[PDB]
Design a protein around this nucleic acid. Sequence first.
DNA 1: CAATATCCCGAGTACATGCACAGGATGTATATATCTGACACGTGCCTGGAGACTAGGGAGTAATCCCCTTGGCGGTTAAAACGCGGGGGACAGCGCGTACGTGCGTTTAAGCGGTGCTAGAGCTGTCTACGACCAATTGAGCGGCCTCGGCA
DNA 2: TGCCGAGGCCGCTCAATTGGTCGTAGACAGCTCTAGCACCGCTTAAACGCACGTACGCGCTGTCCCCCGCGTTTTAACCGCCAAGGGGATTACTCCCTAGTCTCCAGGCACGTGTCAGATATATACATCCTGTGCATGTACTCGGGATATTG
Lengths: 97, 91, 81, 79, 94, 92, 106, 108
Amino acid sequence: HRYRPGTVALREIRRYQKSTELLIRKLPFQRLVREIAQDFKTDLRFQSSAVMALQEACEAYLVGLFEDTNLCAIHAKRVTIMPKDIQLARRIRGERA
Amino acid sequence: PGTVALREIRRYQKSTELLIRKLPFQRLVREIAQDFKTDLRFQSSAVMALQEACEAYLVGLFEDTNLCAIHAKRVTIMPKDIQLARRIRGE
Amino acid sequence: LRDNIQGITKPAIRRLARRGGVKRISGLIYEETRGVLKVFLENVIRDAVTYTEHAKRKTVTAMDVVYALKRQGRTLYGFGG
Amino acid sequence: DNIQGITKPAIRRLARRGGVKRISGLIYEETRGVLKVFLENVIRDAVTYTEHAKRKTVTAMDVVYALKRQGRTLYGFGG
Amino acid sequence: SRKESYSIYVYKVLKQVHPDTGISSKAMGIMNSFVNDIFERIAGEASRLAHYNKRSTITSREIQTAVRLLLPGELAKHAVSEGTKAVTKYTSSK
Amino acid sequence: SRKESYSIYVYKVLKQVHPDTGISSKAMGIMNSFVNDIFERIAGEASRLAHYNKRSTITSREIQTAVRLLLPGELAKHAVSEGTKAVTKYTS
Amino acid sequence: KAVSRSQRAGLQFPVGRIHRHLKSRTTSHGRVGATAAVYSAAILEYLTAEVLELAGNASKDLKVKRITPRHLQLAIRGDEELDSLIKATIAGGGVIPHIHKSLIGK
Amino acid sequence: KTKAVSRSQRAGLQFPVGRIHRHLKSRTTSHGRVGATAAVYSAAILEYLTAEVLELAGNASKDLKVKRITPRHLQLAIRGDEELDSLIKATIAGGGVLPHIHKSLIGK
DNA sequence: CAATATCCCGAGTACATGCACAGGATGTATATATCTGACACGTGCCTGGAGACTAGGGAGTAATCCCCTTGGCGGTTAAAACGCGGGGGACAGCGCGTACGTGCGTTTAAGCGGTGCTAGAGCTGTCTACGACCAATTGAGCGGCCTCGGCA
DNA sequence: TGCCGAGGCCGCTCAATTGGTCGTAGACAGCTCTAGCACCGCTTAAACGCACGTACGCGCTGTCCCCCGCGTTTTAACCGCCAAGGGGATTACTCCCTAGTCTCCAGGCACGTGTCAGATATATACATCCTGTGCATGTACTCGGGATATTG
């Protein structure tokens, strides 16, 4: 027994679109915000709840960018997302060009 | 063939005139305000300041709409492109 | 007033389109674009009339429409403010 | 490098919440680009509000005010 | 040291509209923040109608105009009614 | 009664950088709008900065921060390097 | 015996803590007393639309105590609102389910 | 009584330090506008009217005309990479548009 | 039809609510004060309306070929599942910084007195820029010269 | 052998762009306002900012063990190209409506000044609404076992 390609992708939508939990691991994202910070002011410290408000804002941005990206792929007859889709969505919202 | 339509682009991207007829646009703005209050009077510069902002919105939307038609491998713009450009923009 | 949105005549929409950099315009763009322009006018002239009503004026003035635009992220330079 | 710890399956989860079925293998290294620039733009402001007040730890209020400035408000941590 | 929040008033309103119900400590953070945000929009925007007309004093008729710029659709038509009732009760007792 | 505008200082600054050149009246209204838009954005951000830190005054630093938020790039480090000339000369 | 101005308006929210708040956002000039009674009751009245529309949610899930996966799953579902709060993410709130009609099996 | 020397000339600036101080006080500000903070603000206003006029006459020259009509703003304010970020919100009335045909719509 | 999966129901419980309590700091009262702005009243700009004319533009039609769309294809690049690997997530001690208190004194505001920076003028009065006309050049296709390949 | 049609090179001449020269009409820039209202200088009292001290919260850093991410590889269905078929988007043209200009004529009402009372600020005294704290017990959770739903 083995499902059809497609079956498990739609199973995952109905899962991660019902939970509200955080999707990136804590420590790997905590390392990233420190490295981006020390380029602007050396020997910072972060409050434990500051990095959470970064993460909860990032995930909510990424998830919104994908939701607006899929709209492009669907319009362009595909179902697969590809870089050329993100570059369109992100240009109409005025972020990058 | 297909060249005179392209010759118009090079014309209207050089001139900075207003492109909608003035009186027809002015009478539309008087119509749309009546359902907010009866018997406004419009200052002659207010009607101009609407037109200058409208044309600059419409032409920004056609710039952002064309990008969608290119994405679908087309040339021709279609309402489904305007709809996309407004939905993704957040109107 | 009668039906004055029809006064945004088809050629004028083509001029706006031509400025924006588009080659070929399907015949359904005309009736869609009037729909977009009428929705924009409503949402700005409503604010402009509320700025007017606050000041007890009857005449709508250029600063009222400029303040109306300024709050929607659509600032206009050219008429002051 | 620390940005590669935004692992491939994590991008898939984020994408799955957003509703996409099938993901080109080019989207992983491209998406990291948009996350890396987004963090860059709010940490500049958060460290600016920090340096203003002479303290040298970034607080939750600093990242709240940075996010508020750029039109990406969050209710959660202190409005 | 001590901090002021709308934490008690939202609970007091909750018990007016769903008597059996309560609200999490994680959810209070949100409500308190929504209340701050709408307050700061109304108060911050009300200053500008005072500049545009060159008036000194913030006044009911001014706030009434702020909560028909900042509120959409039918939501505005209800808030404008509700606040008018509140003023009419206050000014009948002083 | 008098109406007041920045129209003369933009003209004075034009003759600083292009001594032959001029402005049409319609193209003056643009500068006379732009220059007061950037006034308001600095005043508004400097005001909030004082409030967040529960100060009453607005010293130089309450503005240098508002410029270092509000300007996008090289313009921030230039404008900060330009304004610190002005106050350094003034305080002599 | 002191009264409270909240009772004269008929409001649950603090009419005199507002007023003192507005008096700190005010150019260099004062604020009419009849502003606090139309400032409040146009902040209450969003509560009893933000809370209140959770009738359609908390009670429907057979669970007591409003929590952050609600408000979301409502404030971004009713649509006279939404416009008031577009500018805000809800922490720990997730998103409403969808799936677009071309991704589901045909 | 030793004449007067305007705060502009003391600072080294062509923008009006006095006028701006009286504008900042009675803006939506808190109750104490220090005088050194109207000099670090005439400066970081005049600096744009250099950095944005400098390049604009820089293009009126190229079209071989003396007086800077309105489109010559647009062709800088929405062409320099930093100005395009500072002025996102601005429509320049009668300013026209920056000319461009999409590279895929030209034939051959 | 078989199988993996989601759905559903009851047990046992580590913890977060919703309450009661002490008490403190700010909302409220009672009285005095002054200046903002509501109300009345002109003067004057200009928003509006109706006429006539010229001519730019829009409307409607006819012919056509450019494009959009559907179908069928050969291939690579993803999804699924398994097996294996490393690194996230759960645990006490130091001392560095945010936070609060006390104090000095830098500096802004408020009143007053004097005059020059600045803004409504004139119809200024030139002199840029706007139409209006002109000449060169490139570009392309068609109508005239000369050698050769396939056919009698 | 031969024959003689098909094929490969040079000027005419119409149509875009580009750069060039003329001339008549507003709209910039320069004075003179000059009258005038704000910036400036000189007193002063006082609010608030800046800078020590030091108390103790909480952010950084070292220790152990599981989920999760990494690596494989088969194969399936999707992205991709391409070729063909229809009609709808364009083009060119004639007839037509009405935008644009100038012109006269009225009267709404924007605009600014003059009065004076209604309104809110500020003080002092004071009492009761809210904050921080410590507390029992009910809700919402995590788990295990079986029923229903749905995929292949």
